[PDB]
């Protein structure tokens, strides 16, 4: 782009560029970079090229500065340990800015919205000016050009993330497609503007914990959809700092999707092939910490079935001209929870994460490997553990060796079951959509919606045990992620039924988490969930394998393959109690009335009425 006009030499940052050229950038990309460099005052500007030489130089830089350690047991794997105040995506510090609040959340009838957190433009201006001026002093501003989706896909969109964290650059190279080829594809096109700072200008005003810069008291993750901007300050972690993932590919993208006729969803995508050589793609929305990654990478127990992974967390979907709902994974890697990952629960993740992977907040073994609760693989006599708090650790310490939200960040092209169409620009045709969460009582293993409207209500009605327990509402697994008013999002989903030629997927709801009276899981889950997927497959083919109930279709007796599982308390796992469901519909009704209020579509109110009526006839 061109040099800004100057009476002095205070606006052109060319002398501080240590990789790339401001003159090579598209005009509007130059203006974004240089305007924010003026505000944030970085010492240098590094324009990322996405090369393997860059990446290795970056990793070396962080290793020299003690920001990450090499895991010498594996091939090109690394470990970062954070400040314990900065360990997760933080919804209480996450906002969306629009002129009118109702564009962002429905105005609730009686209570405070739980469907988003609106901030006015003027309050955001104050917050921005209290944070960003001078915030990169003494640091490098990295410029990360990235594509969400295969480079060129009709469904793909480009962002530019400015950050002062080399951890963010390395993680974005895995999680997105990053570098010079993205700038060449973008040209003078539109892009999402992503600004990120850890909020710790040098010299440091406050103590640095574990070599991990953050500013918990000023953390703020903001989204300005009308300006196509995402501005995040004070956290270096996950969905707060890797701005392509939740901030772009769910919050900004769900609003662009509403504007443009598509969907952006917190869904895995998988391909499943049966023993008769037929393959189908499924999408599934479960809340965080409710097993999407385990399902997306399943190793099925049933012989002759195969599952392949297209993505594990975000889906972008659009009807094509033929009426098929086509989906892409806009991500380029998996940002998976590490604890609980074992050969029993996710053997294909175990395979994937031993090369080219960055781990955050797991334990390190003395021979340079990784450990966490639930890994279920013993260490040789002699090998010791350093916990994620950087302290010698043993099991008699009561605290976990890994933080419960610790992650791996691994390339998708390495997974041994990555689907052969996972980067197809046309996307994959979705034939079923699965909702679900953690329900210890009342909700059976699987049911099928009665109609598309009923299915949209079942997404709306989702609830899940918080991870005393509380049963939270998390409609469509999107509660922390709606880019705009949920009522309008329901209308958008309902409207897909009115598109001529639309081939609507079947909608299901699952529950892996039902417990008996003693608190034991009724269903063994994991790869045995292949039995539930086989039933859903047959359903999509029209098999006569369902029985009607008040909450939807369930498997007929004998319809699930439970060979090898004769031991299961089938009475309890599939049972439907009038008393539980009368209470459930009352909670659903109270939630939708308060939280969606004047923006609740008629058709969702009608499905609530019909479910109440069907339960009343039990
Ligand atoms: N009982 C049971 N637990 C399951 C099953 N599948 C996954 N889990 C549990 O789900 C958790 C793992 O899910 P996460 O990786 O946290 O879930 P996610 O949906 O991928 O979350 P995000 O990556 O945060 O969006 C662990 O507690 C697992 O034991 C299943 O079939 N049965
Ligand atoms: O919280 C989630 O749903 C996640 O996938 C982790 S993060 O990307 O939000 O950090
Ligand atoms: Mn996951
Ligand atoms: Mn997620
Ligand atoms: Na650290």
451 and 593 housed in the same domain: yes
Answer yes or no: are the C-beta atoms of 467 and 292 closer than 8 Å. no
Nearest-CA residue for atom 1 of ligand 1:
513
Last residue of a domain, one of 231, 261, 291: 261
Q: How far is the CA of 210 from the centre of ligand 5 (A)?
A: 4
Last residue of a domain, one of 207, 236, 261: 261
Question: How far is 91 from 457, CA to CA, in rounded Å?
Answer: 25
Instruction: Collect residues with CB below 5 Å from ion ligand 4.
Output: 313
Cα gap 494→460, rounded to integer Å: 11
Is 238 close to ligand 2, i.e. is its CB under 6 Å away? yes
Does ligand 2 lie within 6 Å of residue 245's CB atom?
A: yes
d(CA 596, CA 109): 8
Residues 476 and 521 in one domain: yes
The range of the structural domain enclosing residue 449 comes to: 262-331+417-618
Strand boundaries in 100-210, DSSP class E: 118-119, 140-148, 157-163, 177-178, 192-197
Task: Give the C-alpha separation, 349 to 420, whole Å.
Answer: 17
Residues 340 and 226 in one domain: no
Any atom of ligand 1 within 6 Å of the Cβ of 313: yes
CA distance 256 to 252: 6
Residue 559 burial by Cβ neighbours in a 10 Å radius (0-12, 13-18, 19+): middle
Atom of ligand 1 nearest to the CA of 337: 15
Residues paired with residue 333 on neighbouring β-strands, in sequence order: 411
Is 283 part of a structural domain of the chain? yes
Residue located via tokens 């980067």: 423
Instruction: Look at residue 227 and tell me if it is in a domain.
Output: yes
CATH of the domain at 393: 2.170.8.10
Residue 543: alpha-carbon gap to chain centroid: 33
- Cβ pair 194, 159 in contact under 8 A: yes
Instruction: Judge if 495 and 608 occupy the same domain.
Output: yes
**Ligand number, closest to the Cα atom of 479:** 2
Assign residue 479 the CATH number of its domain: 3.90.228.20
**What residues does 157 pair with on adjacent strands?**
148
Does ligand 2 have an atom closer than 6 angstroms to the CB of 312? Answer: no
The vertex-488 CA angle with 484 and 493, nearest 5°, equals 110
558 CA from centroid of ligand 2 (Å): 38
The residues after which the chain has a C–N gap greater than 2.5 Å are 467
> HEC profile for 127-156?
HHHCCCCCCCCCCEEEEEEEEECCCCCCCC
**Segment holding 574, helix H or strand E:** helix 570-574
H or E, element range at 40: helix 27-40
Place of tokens 């079923």: 432
Query: Ligand 1 in contact with 337 (CB < 6 A)?
Result: yes
Is there a single domain that holds both residue 256 and residue 323? no
574 alpha carbon to ligand 5 midpoint, in Å?
47
State the closest ligand 1 atom to the C-alpha of 286, by its place in the atom list counted from 1: 19
Q: Ligand 1 centre from 257 Cα, in Å? A: 28
**Ligand 1 in reach of 254 Cβ (< 6 A):** no
Q: Is 170 among the domain residues?
A: yes
Residues 518 and 467 in one domain: yes
Atom 10 (ligand 1) nearest CA: 291
Q: Which residues are CB-contacts of 7 (< 8 A; sequence separation ≥ 6)?
A: none
Single residue among 261, 293, 311 that ends a domain in this structure: 261
- The method of structure determination was X-ray
Asked whether 398 and 409 are in contact (CB, 8 A), the reply is: no
Instruction: State the total domains in the chain.
Output: 3
612 and 483 share one domain: yes
- Euclidean distance between CA atoms 554 and 584, whole angstroms: 18
Structure tokens at 483: 């880019």
Q: Is the residue at 250 inside a domain?
A: yes
| Eight-class DSSP state of 519 | S
Burial group, residue 109, by CB count within 10 angstroms (0-12, 13-18, 19+): middle
Residue 7 domain-assigned (yes or no): no
| Tokens (6 digits) for 10 | 């205070």
CA of 481, closest atom in ligand 2: 3
Tell me, yes or no, whether 152 lies in a domain.
Answer: yes
The answer to whether residue 274 is domain-embedded is yes
> 56: domain CATH number?
3.40.449.10
* Cβ 172 vs Cβ 146: under 8 Å: yes
Q: In this structure, is residue 3 part of a structural domain?
A: no
CA 281 to chain centre: 19
Our answer on whether the CB atom of 311 is closer than 6 Å to any ligand 2 atom is: no
Catalytic positions, please?
290
Nearest CA to ligand 1 atom 4: 291
82, 148, 230, 238: residue to mutate for ligand 2 pocket, most atoms within 8 A of CB: 238
Question: From the annotation, which residues make up the binding site for Mn(2+)?
Answer: 246, 266, 313
Ligand 2 atom at shortest distance from the alpha carbon of 287: 3
Asked whether residue 100 falls in the same domain as residue 159, the answer is: yes
| 253 and 266 both lie in a single domain | no
- Integer-rounded Cα Rg, in Å, for the chain is 24
Between the CA of 405 and the centroid of ligand 1 the distance, in Å, is 12
Tell me if 521 CB under 6 Å of ligand 1: yes
Residues 71 and 197 in one domain: no
Residue closest via CA to ligand 2's atom 2 equals 288
Annotated binding site: 89, 237-239, 246, 266, 288-294, 313, 405-407, 438, 526-529
* Cα dist from 225 to 61, 91, 187, 594, 598, whole Å: 35, 18, 22, 26, 23
> What sections of 226-346 are H helices per DSSP?
238-241, 253-260, 292-296
Please check whether residues 183 and 38 belong to one and the same domain.
yes
Neighbours of 203 (CB within 10 A): 7
407 lines ligand 2 (CB under 6 A): no
Task: Name which residue sits closest to atom 1 of ligand 2, judged by CA.
Answer: 288
Dihedral, CA atoms, 306, 309, 313, 317, nearest 10 degrees?
-100
All residues at 6 or more sequence positions from 67 whose CB lies less than 8 Å from its CB, including other chains: 80, 166, 167, 211, 212
Q: Are residues 226 and 295 in the same domain?
A: no
């Amino acid at each position: 782009g061109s040099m800004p006009p100057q009476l002095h030499n205070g606006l052109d940052f060319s002398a501080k560029v240590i990789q790339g050229s401001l003159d090579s950038l598209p005009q509007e990309v130059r203006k974004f970079v240089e305007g924010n460099a003026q505000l944030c005052q970085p010492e240098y500007i590094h324009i990322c090229d996405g090369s393997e030489e860059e990446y290795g130089r970056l990793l070396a830089h962080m290793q020299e500065e003690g920001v990450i350690r090499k895991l010498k047991k594996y091939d090109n794997c690394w470990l970062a340990l954070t400040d314990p105040r900065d360990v997760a995506r933080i919804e209480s510090k996450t906002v969306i800015i629009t002129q009118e609040q109702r564009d962002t959340v429905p105005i609730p009838k009686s209570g405070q919205s739980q469907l988003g957190r609106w901030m006015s433009e003027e309050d955001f201006e104050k917050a921005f000016n209290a944070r960003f001026p001078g915030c990169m002093k003494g640091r490098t501003m990295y410029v990360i050009p990235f594509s969400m989706g295969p480079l060129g896909s009709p469904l793909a969109k480009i962002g530019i993330e400015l950050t002062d964290s080399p951890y963010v650059v390395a993680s974005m190279r895995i999680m997105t497609r990053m570098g010079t080829s993205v700038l060449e594809a973008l040209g003078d096109g539109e892009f999402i503007k992503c600004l990120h700072s850890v909020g710790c200008p040098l010299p440091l005003k406050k103590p640095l914990v574990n070599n991990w810069a953050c500013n918990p008291e000023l953390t703020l993750i903001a989204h300005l959809p009308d300006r196509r901007e995402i501005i995040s300050f004070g956290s270096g972690y996950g969905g707060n700092s890797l701005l392509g993932k939740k901030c772009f590919a769910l919050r900004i993208a769900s609003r662009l999707a509403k504007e443009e006729g598509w969907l952006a969803e917190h869904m895995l995508i998988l391909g499943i092939t049966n023993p008769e050589g037929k393959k189908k793609y499924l999408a599934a929305a479960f809340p965080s910490a409710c097993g999407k990654t385990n399902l997306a990478m399943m190793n099925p127990t049933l012989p002759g079935w195969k599952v392949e992974c297209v993505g594990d967390d975000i889906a972008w979907m659009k009807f094509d001209a033929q009426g098929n709902l086509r989906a892409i994974n806009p991500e380029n890697g998996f940002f998976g929870v590490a604890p609980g990952t074992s050969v029993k629960t996710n053997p294909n993740a175990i395979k994937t994460i031993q090369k080219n992977t960055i781990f955050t907040n797991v334990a390190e073994t003395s021979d340079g490997g990784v450990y966490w609760e639930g890994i279920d693989e013993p260490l040789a006599p002699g090998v010791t553990i350093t916990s994620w708090k950087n302290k010698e650790w043993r099991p008699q310490d009561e605290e976990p060796c890994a933080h419960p939200n610790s992650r791996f960040c691994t390339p998708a092209s390495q997974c041994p079951i990555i689907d052969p169409a996972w980067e197809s620009p046309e996307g994959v045709p979705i034939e079923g959509i699965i909702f679900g969460g953690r329900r210890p009582a009342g909700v059976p293993l699987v049911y099928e919606a009665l109609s598309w409207q009923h299915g949209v209500f079942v997404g709306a009605a989702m609830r899940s045990e918080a991870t005393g327990k509380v049963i939270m509402h998390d409609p469509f697994a999107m509660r922390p992620f709606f880019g705009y008013n949920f009522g309008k999002y329901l209308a958008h989903w309902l409207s897909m039924a009115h598109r001529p030629a639309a081939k609507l997927p079947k909608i299901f709801h699952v529950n892996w988490f039902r417990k008996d009276k003693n608190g034991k899981f009724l269903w063994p889950g994991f790869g045995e969930n292949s039995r539930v997927l086989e039933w859903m497959f047959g359903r999509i083919e029209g098999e006569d394998s369902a029985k009607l109930t008040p909450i939807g279709y369930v498997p007929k007796e004998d319809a699930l393959n439970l060979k090898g599982l004769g031991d299961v308390n089938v009475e309890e796992l599939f049972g439907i109690s009038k008393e539980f469901w009368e209470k459930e519909v009352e909670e659903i009704d109270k939630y939708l009335e308060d939280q969606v209020n004047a923006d609740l579509p008629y058709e969702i109110e009608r499905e609530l009425r019909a479910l109440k009526q069907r339960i009343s006839q039990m």
